Design a binder for this molecule. Structure first.
Ligand code: 9BG
Ligand code: 9BG
Lengths: 195, 195
């Protein structure tokens, strides 16, 4: 039966289907393996070694992941089918950053959250900056901040912070005092979508 | 002057130094770029496309990461220097899995936690299994469990679970009801150390 893809931005989230950033689908395509994709008889190259951090928030559920992206100067519409080089539909158009479009599916490093009670914020990580909790700065400032917060007892997580940089991505969680409760690091460079 | 490396297992953790699994160091070596290392003038090959999830727990702080590993049939002792091909020390022996040794430093995807109040548990992710919260099972069972828990309101995180598989690694966090509050996925296969 035909593979279906529903755009979350058009109210298409379905908990029974596979969940990717901006997409609920009846199939689960591993989109890491594609170097070329097709949209309406036009071929586009997947960018090597830089990705797009994409996320949707549907039904108090956060669905984020590092996705492959391809360069296309033409305007493509949300929901347009994306094909492989054998005519199979593998995704739909979702997110964009200037002339780059995300290829959503089973992609790279991902973050899923239950959004009730916590907040989430997205930042561009400036090159050369280190990250602690809800702040980013030069290494020495961050190191001194971390040592200061070492005296405090950890409280419950209230906010998550996503840091998207040219060489690395990170996700931190803080309590009400700004103490870093958790840090994950994704060793890839990426960009954020532009609405 | 001279790069220093201190083994956490020998009480060497220092908050003022760079922190990696099992190591506090005065330098931060990016160990992703090495394909061969030297220990006692003998060369060993870094394993392609499979890694070791290593962690130490020091001063109520969890320091884990996916690290490169190399195959060595000889016995190497914790703290023994690891060199590159040019004779420079880049790391020390830390963790082992039979004939594989971790190369600790700035590695691949990482997880840092504040251990006060929450617990952390490590699991081998069986091939073909999906993960929800504190359980791993076939896809249909996991989807059905997730939908059941979708009705519950999320509570505070009390436990983290690390899932190390042959093709993927995941970290989830659960509340007291077993509801999944958070999921990160690392798109790499790995093994756990054997004590
Ligand atoms: N979406 C997604 N992104 C990835 O980057 C990725 N990498 C691997 N996999 C695995 O592919 C198999 C299915 O193709 C699954 O074994 C999946 O393993 P898993 O990643 O271990 O998660 C178990 C399911 O459980 C899902 N859930 C998690 N929370 C919920 C929820 N509240 N309601 C409904 N479903 C939930 C979770 O999304 C998931 O199911 P879906 O594929 O249908 O999305 C991925 N899946
Ligand atoms: N350890 C480590 N593992 C990696 O896989 C990695 N990938 C990149 N980097 C960056 O390298 C620069 C320094 O080499 C830093 O900019 C760092 O970016 P960042 O990872 O953004 O910075 C947060 C700093 O701050 C550190 N802290 C975090 N919590 C504490 C604490 N309680 N006490 C003391 N320090 C703490 C945290 O470990 C850290 O500093 P350290 O290197 O000294 O470990 C890594 N660092």
């Amino acid at each position: 039966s035909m593979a279906m893809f529903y755009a979350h931005a058009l109210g298409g989230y379905d908990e029974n289907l596979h969940a990717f950033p901006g997409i609920s689908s009846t199939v689960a395509n591993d989109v890491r393996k594609y170097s070329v994709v097709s949209v309406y008889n036009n071929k586009y190259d997947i960018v090597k070694d830089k990705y797009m951090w994409c996320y949707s928030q549907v039904n108090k559920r956060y669905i984020g992941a590092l996705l492959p992206m391809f360069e296309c100067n033409e305007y493509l519409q949300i929901g347009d089918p994306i094909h492989d080089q054998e005519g199979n539909q593998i995704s739909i158009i979702t997110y964009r950053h200037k002339n780059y479009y995300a290829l959503s599916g089973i992609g790279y490093e991902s973050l899923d959250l239950c959004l009730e009670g916590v907040g989430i914020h997205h930042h561009v990580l400036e090159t050369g900056n280190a990250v602690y909790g809800k702040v980013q700065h030069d290494y020495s400032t961050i190191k001194e901040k971390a040592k200061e917060m070492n005296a405090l007892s950890p409280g419950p997580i209230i906010d998550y912070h996503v840091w998207i940089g040219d060489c690395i991505c990170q996700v931190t969680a803080v309590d009400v005092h700004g103490k870093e409760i958790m840090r994950m690091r994704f060793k890839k460079g990426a960009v954020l979508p532009i609405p």
